[PDB]
Amino acid sequence: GYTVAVVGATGAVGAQMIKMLEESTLPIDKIRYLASARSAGKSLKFKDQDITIEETTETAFEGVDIALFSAGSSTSAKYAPYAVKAGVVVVDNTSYFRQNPDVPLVVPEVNAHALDAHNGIIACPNCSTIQMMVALEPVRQKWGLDRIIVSTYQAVSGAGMGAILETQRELREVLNDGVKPCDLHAEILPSGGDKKHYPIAFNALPQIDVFTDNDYTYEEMKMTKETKKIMEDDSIAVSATCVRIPVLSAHSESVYIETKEVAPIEEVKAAIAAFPGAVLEDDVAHQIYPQAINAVGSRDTFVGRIRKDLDAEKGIHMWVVSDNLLKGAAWNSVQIAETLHERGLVRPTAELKFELKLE
Amino acid sequence: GYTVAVVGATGAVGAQMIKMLEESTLPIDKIRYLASARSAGKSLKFKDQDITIEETTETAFEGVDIALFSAGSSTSAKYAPYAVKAGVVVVDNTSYFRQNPDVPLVVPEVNAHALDAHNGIIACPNCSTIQMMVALEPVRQKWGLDRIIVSTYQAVSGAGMGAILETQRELREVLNDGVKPCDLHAEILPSGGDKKHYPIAFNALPQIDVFTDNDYTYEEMKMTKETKKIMEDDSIAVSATCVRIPVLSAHSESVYIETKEVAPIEEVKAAIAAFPGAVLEDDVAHQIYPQAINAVGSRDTFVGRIRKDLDAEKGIHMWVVSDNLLKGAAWNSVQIAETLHERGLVRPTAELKFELK
Ligand SMILES: NC(=O)c1ccc[n+]([C@@H]2O[C@H](COP(=O)([O-])OP(=O)(O)OC[C@H]3O[C@@H](n4cnc5c(N)ncnc54)[C@H](OP(=O)(O)O)[C@@H]3O)[C@@H](O)[C@H]2O)c1
Ligand SMILES: NC(=O)c1ccc[n+]([C@@H]2O[C@H](COP(=O)([O-])OP(=O)(O)OC[C@H]3O[C@@H](n4cnc5c(N)ncnc54)[C@H](OP(=O)(O)O)[C@@H]3O)[C@@H](O)[C@H]2O)c1
Ligand SMILES: O=C(O)C/C=C/c1cccc(C(=O)O)c1C(=O)O
Ligand code: NA
Ligand code: NA
């Protein structure tokens, strides 16, 4: 069996990493929980066993086969290469390595083939991107993809435990204490690192991550660049608007595409239904469509409201929902680990290709 | 001065109609409040004055100069033609008369000219449509509009007072009693008239109004058809996805357009800023953009996140927010009543064009 390390075990994603590993087929002989100085020393369960949380360091990875990183870009940047040097295979949840040509950016249903040539780090795409890829890959396979326009409806848990607590606190102030939404004090949303913070309670915030110099946010640009890389096709035009709404868990997306060939809607429904990881929830006569609240807890990605555009011959609209901490993060990661095991790819990389940041 | 009736004074829109009328320049000699049998006899303020609510009937409209209807399609269908017969000019917030070619469908900043030839009923468009017209008309004026793709983020007040209360109750159950959202009981959303009801707390429901034969909802199709009539151009391609989110007041819209000619973004910003009823809130260096919670209570429509498509030469994306009960409903209506007064159009109509029911 394997020695598995979860880096960022104590946060929003980490708690789901733990659940997904508890429910995994991976043969696990030993679990180790890593976090920051703040949590180092506390205790947390794996199944019935108590595990002591360790501060993440350059030397914490000795004897580790697999490490799942969900502790923020800076932490992956700093310690993931030292894990690779020590012999680990890393599955990284953060943005840091996603656009690195030496790193497979993987959604196992779509591009598991990219895993074979790994160099010790496999990157998880962004949650919003992952569910979109699960919905669209079956379509792309049969009728091609010319362009995508997407407006997202993103849950606060995407911004971490702190953002969940902040959201809940704000809603309680308004609903129980009669505070006006515009009078609320926010500390984290829309983005913990940006300069100004706004309330999410009864609001919709058209900012996720920070602004880039083209006036799209990094979240929007991630959807653009990550799609191109995952589908191995720079020609696919992708523009996004990424919006936070008062939902704790599960992202929703209004997705527009234009195919290369005309894709009959009833065949699109069938192809999506037949694709692993994607579930068709689309029966308007009984008001059946994906909903954030029903997606929570499921590893599947749900697709519905599938219909042709009223004007564009090759245009198609749909609604895609998935739990952003499961398929959007922890399940994708564990599923990559499982796929690595299946393909005999859990073993040390001889040649280090990633900059060591701590000398 | 005028005698003004508010039909549906007791509901979510009615309450704002009262507010907008209280704050209006319209010379009002007499105010009357009309609702259902079950509100008749109740008292409701107009400023400091106590007004007794009356039941809406076929003969309630004698002496009325202006009637603002926001009592539901069925109520406008039944009584509006009788109001017109009594010599009223009706401003209707409902969908019932919107696609009647004898009925102007008006956003006063966009197509005030359409008021002049009215036959006693003016229709206010759908809330989601109105804010989009305010944002896009100044762009259309300078560079044309070829197509629109919009995804909405719509407040629950759009489905009425009952929906607001249901949403508040749901949220309280999850936050205070630890109910899982998927175990909540619902009775109104997504649509009161449809067969099945679903929770909106911590949800996003991709259904507003009922489904039509083509698998778009009536809300989505109203956005398409109303745009074409307002802008007087059936060639504008319009497709919508309308989604309810857990916000009580103010609709937000992610809008994508393709113009006929390329529109420099700084000029697009300037045009919108200069358009009456539209306010530019767009300074991403300081994270300035429209926000539902900031829009609540304002008559203005706020526009931001304005940017070129990454690939389509003539493509532009933006974010448009407005209070759905003000510009989306009660303010658009009062503003039509004010424009009618300005233009000397508050007078009986000779020709009866609407069948008595
Ligand atoms: N695939 C996706 O789309 C997706 C979705 C969500 C998140 N993510 C990624 O996962 C990261 C964490 O997300 P989250 O929502 O779980 O955040 P979170 O709830 O804020 O938790 C942050 C976690 O990182 C740990 N951490 C912070 N600084 C550290 C350091 N210097 N060394 C070691 N550990 C450190 C924290 O440990 P302490 O308890 O000790 O602070 C905690 O376990 C995000 O920053 C993002 O990069 C990806
Ligand atoms: N009296 C009651 O117990 C009662 C029962 C049901 C609904 N309502 C109204 O509706 C609200 C409940 O939620 P909602 O979402 O349904 O309201 P809403 O959409 O916010 O407003 C509905 C409006 O249409 C009016 N209306 C309904 N039937 C009518 C008729 N036959 N003739 C003239 N006007 C009519 C209502 O007046 P009415 O107040 O006369 O209904 C109300 O002003 C209440 O706040 C109240 O305004 C009242
Ligand atoms: O906000 C969301 O819905 C998803 C958040 C993702 C996220 C948040 C903070 C940092 C990062 C990051 O690693 O840069 C990321 C990410 O792209 O995975
Ligand atoms: Na499937
Ligand atoms: Na094998």
Side-chain angles (χ1 to χ4, degrees), chain A residues 73 93-95 98 126-127 154-155 158-159 208 219 222 244 251:
Chain A
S73 276
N93 226 40
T94 78
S95 62
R98 294 188 185 142
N126 182 256
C127 37
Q154 286 180 241
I208 296 191
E219 184 78 354
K222 287 184 227 150
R244 195 83 63 183
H251 296 339

Side-chain angles (χ1 to χ4, degrees), chain A residues 4-7 13-14 16-18 20-21 24 26 66-71 89-94 98 106-109 115 122-127 130 299 324-341 346:
Chain A
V4 178
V6 182
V7 186
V13 172
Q16 300 312 315
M17 298 207 145
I18 288 165
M20 294 298 99
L21 283 169
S24 168
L26 266 339
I66 298 168
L68 309 175
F69 275 62
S70 186
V89 189
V90 168
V91 183
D92 180 19
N93 226 40
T94 78
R98 294 188 185 142
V106 179
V107 189
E109 294 89 351
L115 294 167
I122 303 88
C124 206
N126 182 256
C127 37
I130 297 167
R299 297 170 181 75
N324 59 297
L325 304 182
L326 299 180
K327 185 56 170 173
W331 164 238
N332 199 69
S333 293
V334 164
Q335 192 189 15
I336 290 169
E338 284 169 358
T339 310
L340 289 161
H341 167 69
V346 182

Side-chain angles (χ1 to χ4, degrees), chain B residues 285-298:
Chain B
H286 297 109
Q287 303 167 261
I288 298 300
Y289 32 70
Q291 290 186 43
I293 63 181
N294 292 338
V296 172
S298 173

Side-chain angles (χ1 to χ4, degrees), chain A residues 272-279:
Chain A
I272 288 168
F275 195 77
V279 170

